[PDB]
Amino acid sequence: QKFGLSAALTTPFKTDGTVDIDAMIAHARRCLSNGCDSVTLFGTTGEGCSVGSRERQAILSSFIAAGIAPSRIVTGVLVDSIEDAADQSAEALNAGARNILLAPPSYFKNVSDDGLFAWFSAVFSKIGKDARDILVYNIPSVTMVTLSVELVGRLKAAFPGIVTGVKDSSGNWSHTERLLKEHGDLAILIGDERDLARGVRLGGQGAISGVANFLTQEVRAMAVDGKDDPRIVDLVVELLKFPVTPAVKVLVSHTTGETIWSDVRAPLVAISPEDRRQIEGAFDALFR
Amino acid sequence: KFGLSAALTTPFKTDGTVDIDAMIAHARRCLSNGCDSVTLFGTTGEGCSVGSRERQAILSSFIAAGIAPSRIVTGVLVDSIEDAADQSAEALNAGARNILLAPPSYFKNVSDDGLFAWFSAVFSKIGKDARDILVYNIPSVTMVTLSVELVGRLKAAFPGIVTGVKDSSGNWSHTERLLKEHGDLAILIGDERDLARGVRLGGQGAISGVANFLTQEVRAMAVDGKDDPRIVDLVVELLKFPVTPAVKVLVSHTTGETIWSDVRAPLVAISPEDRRQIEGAFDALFR
Ligand SMILES: [Mg+2]
């Protein structure tokens, strides 16, 4: 019944910049076959911020027509208005998505817990009676919006069955450990690989993982089975030298032989040939 | 020249919906009191908090009420090429004077090359209709600085498409370089300390939050290039609080319209004590 392992699925682009939907679906099927319980579309690693509001509708519809069960799909929602967050969430939930991965709004800076509580509440009200299965996304290194333990408690208390978990990508164990003690009744999912297995052993329900795009079984052992893997921790450090999402895509290409993954959407830029060789070398030293 | 545009505040009802009547009346007041245009859905307008459907209804309502499209600028503050192009094309097709286009603001620490590619892709997607884009440099909010070099690249590649820059950095050495290197474009200045000086150096005006409640005073800076230390001193005061909620406090104070108090989450309304402080600071300078 736990959340388990979800791939933070990468989004492949053709040379003309459009989404390669067949390649995307095939990659999802591979990740599911290799140990993911679900795939998360349009998250950070998916460049979801860069995927249009019409594109995401086309992609979700195509995934469902291709026969991937909606209950094996999580959709990231990374927008700044109540209306758009509710609309995107409602559409995915109506389609049968397992969960929404909902970021707080990320335009205004230095926002208060009270402001955030009110925003989430307004989104949930706007979704309406069908609201369910929202995982709130704590990724302050990207959004510059922390979801405090206290805020998570306020949300859980007010919205039982609606706020069902937290994706904690803070890399702040002092925070994560409190999420587990106070809110481990929810699905507490852990972004920082060094504390993933540790957190699973303390009741964490898994991960929405970028590395799981190319080391699925290895991440599953951590996220589901609660087993450490120092090689994964080391890989993530070795890759700090490079933009995270473009480097993950380089390793999808390296492990699969699929050249499509090279390409990223602006405002990201391609990893250079020399830097790709460094990334592949770091991977090979650990896993090949 | 561009002149003075109000960075128009967006009024909300107690139930949270947009008070479109109050918004249009406020725009007419700002226009009548010295704005050449009004900018909808910018930072001061809480544009990030205005939904993709709401903005369409608001823009249609403005135009149906008889506000000239050539006196409307629309902020576009999204992170995807498709949505930036869709929103921009819609406003341009409706006859908006300009788009105020922010760079995407989810990913952090992005490169000039990535930004050039993003803007280029937006403009290609809009197509031949693309015109009158003001690129928005507000790094204190977006965490994305538009460098002088990037502005040059955009101007060179997209003449008539990239027609200006709204520089809200408050970084004079930056602004001064924009003016000196790219003053052939409409360089508009957000920092009040810098507005009149920049206008004297060839700046074309401002999209101004303070112009919601001190329109004539900002016009003398933005159009006539005259320093006003009172405005600078007031901005020092407004920067002690979340800026947009504090601006709204002063729209309420100067107009007697209570509606402006309310802000949309994730903002929170200014407290009664802080409101009296802001009003007192204003009164000490302007009343
Ligand atoms: Mg955004």
Short mmCIF file of all heavy atoms in Angstrom, two decimals, chain A residues 49 78-81 105-107, chain B residues 48 77-80 104-106, ligand 1:
data_model
loop_
_atom_site.label_atom_id
_atom_site.label_comp_id
_atom_site.label_asym_id
_atom_site.label_seq_id
_atom_site.Cartn_x
_atom_site.Cartn_y
_atom_site.Cartn_z
N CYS A 49 8.07 22.45 -15.54
CA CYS A 49 7.92 23.91 -15.65
C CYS A 49 7.97 24.37 -17.10
O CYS A 49 7.33 25.37 -17.47
CB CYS A 49 8.99 24.63 -14.82
SG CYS A 49 10.68 24.00 -15.08
N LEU A 78 3.26 22.72 -10.93
CA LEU A 78 4.37 23.61 -10.62
C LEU A 78 4.05 25.03 -10.98
O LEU A 78 4.86 25.74 -11.53
CB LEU A 78 5.64 23.15 -11.34
CG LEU A 78 6.07 21.69 -11.20
CD1 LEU A 78 7.33 21.42 -12.03
CD2 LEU A 78 6.31 21.30 -9.72
N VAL A 79 2.83 25.46 -10.72
CA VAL A 79 2.32 26.79 -11.15
C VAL A 79 2.09 27.71 -9.97
O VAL A 79 2.27 27.36 -8.78
CB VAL A 79 1.07 26.65 -12.02
CG1 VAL A 79 1.42 25.88 -13.29
CG2 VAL A 79 -0.04 25.97 -11.24
N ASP A 80 1.73 28.95 -10.28
CA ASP A 80 1.74 29.99 -9.25
C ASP A 80 0.37 30.53 -8.89
O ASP A 80 0.24 31.25 -7.91
CB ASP A 80 2.67 31.12 -9.66
CG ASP A 80 4.03 30.57 -10.06
OD1 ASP A 80 4.53 29.70 -9.30
OD2 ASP A 80 4.55 30.97 -11.12
N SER A 81 -0.66 30.18 -9.65
CA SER A 81 -2.00 30.67 -9.38
C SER A 81 -2.85 29.54 -8.85
O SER A 81 -2.70 28.36 -9.21
CB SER A 81 -2.64 31.26 -10.65
OG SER A 81 -2.83 30.26 -11.64
N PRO A 105 3.35 27.90 -4.85
CA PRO A 105 3.64 28.90 -5.85
C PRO A 105 5.06 29.46 -5.65
O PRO A 105 5.55 29.55 -4.52
CB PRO A 105 2.55 29.94 -5.57
CG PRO A 105 2.25 29.80 -4.09
CD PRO A 105 2.34 28.34 -3.88
N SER A 106 5.72 29.82 -6.75
CA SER A 106 7.17 30.04 -6.77
C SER A 106 7.59 31.31 -7.49
O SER A 106 8.73 31.42 -7.95
CB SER A 106 7.86 28.79 -7.37
OG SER A 106 7.53 28.55 -8.72
N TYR A 107 6.69 32.28 -7.57
CA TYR A 107 7.04 33.59 -8.12
C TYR A 107 7.38 34.56 -6.98
O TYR A 107 8.53 34.98 -6.83
CB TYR A 107 5.91 34.09 -9.04
CG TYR A 107 6.26 35.37 -9.77
CD1 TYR A 107 6.95 35.38 -10.99
CD2 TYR A 107 5.93 36.61 -9.24
CE1 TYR A 107 7.23 36.57 -11.63
CE2 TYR A 107 6.24 37.80 -9.89
CZ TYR A 107 6.89 37.77 -11.07
OH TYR A 107 7.20 38.95 -11.74
N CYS B 48 1.12 36.81 -11.15
CA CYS B 48 1.42 35.40 -10.92
C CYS B 48 0.27 34.66 -10.27
O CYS B 48 0.10 33.46 -10.48
CB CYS B 48 2.68 35.28 -10.05
SG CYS B 48 2.64 36.30 -8.53
N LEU B 77 4.20 36.04 -17.08
CA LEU B 77 5.06 35.66 -15.96
C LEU B 77 5.07 34.14 -15.79
O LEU B 77 5.01 33.62 -14.68
CB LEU B 77 4.58 36.30 -14.65
CG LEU B 77 4.33 37.82 -14.61
CD1 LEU B 77 3.79 38.24 -13.25
CD2 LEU B 77 5.58 38.63 -14.98
N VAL B 78 5.15 33.42 -16.88
CA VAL B 78 5.08 31.94 -16.90
C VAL B 78 6.41 31.30 -17.23
O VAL B 78 7.41 32.00 -17.54
CB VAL B 78 3.98 31.47 -17.86
CG1 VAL B 78 2.65 32.00 -17.36
CG2 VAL B 78 4.33 31.87 -19.33
N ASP B 79 6.45 29.97 -17.15
CA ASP B 79 7.74 29.28 -17.24
C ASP B 79 7.92 28.43 -18.47
O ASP B 79 9.03 27.97 -18.73
CB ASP B 79 7.95 28.47 -15.96
CG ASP B 79 7.76 29.33 -14.74
OD1 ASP B 79 8.30 30.46 -14.74
OD2 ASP B 79 7.06 28.90 -13.81
N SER B 80 6.87 28.27 -19.27
CA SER B 80 6.96 27.47 -20.49
C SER B 80 6.86 28.35 -21.70
O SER B 80 6.17 29.38 -21.72
CB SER B 80 5.86 26.40 -20.50
OG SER B 80 4.58 27.01 -20.58
N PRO B 104 11.48 32.76 -17.63
CA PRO B 104 10.96 31.69 -16.80
C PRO B 104 11.67 31.71 -15.45
O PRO B 104 12.85 32.07 -15.36
CB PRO B 104 11.31 30.44 -17.62
CG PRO B 104 12.55 30.85 -18.43
CD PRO B 104 12.27 32.27 -18.77
N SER B 105 10.95 31.32 -14.40
CA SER B 105 11.35 31.60 -13.03
C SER B 105 11.20 30.39 -12.09
O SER B 105 11.11 30.56 -10.87
CB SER B 105 10.58 32.83 -12.50
OG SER B 105 9.19 32.58 -12.42
N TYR B 106 11.20 29.19 -12.64
CA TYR B 106 11.23 27.98 -11.82
C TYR B 106 12.67 27.51 -11.64
O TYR B 106 13.20 27.54 -10.52
CB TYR B 106 10.30 26.91 -12.42
CG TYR B 106 10.16 25.68 -11.54
CD1 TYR B 106 9.22 25.62 -10.53
CD2 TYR B 106 10.97 24.56 -11.74
CE1 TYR B 106 9.13 24.47 -9.71
CE2 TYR B 106 10.86 23.43 -10.97
CZ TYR B 106 9.93 23.39 -9.97
OH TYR B 106 9.80 22.27 -9.15
MG MG C 1 5.99 29.99 -12.32
#
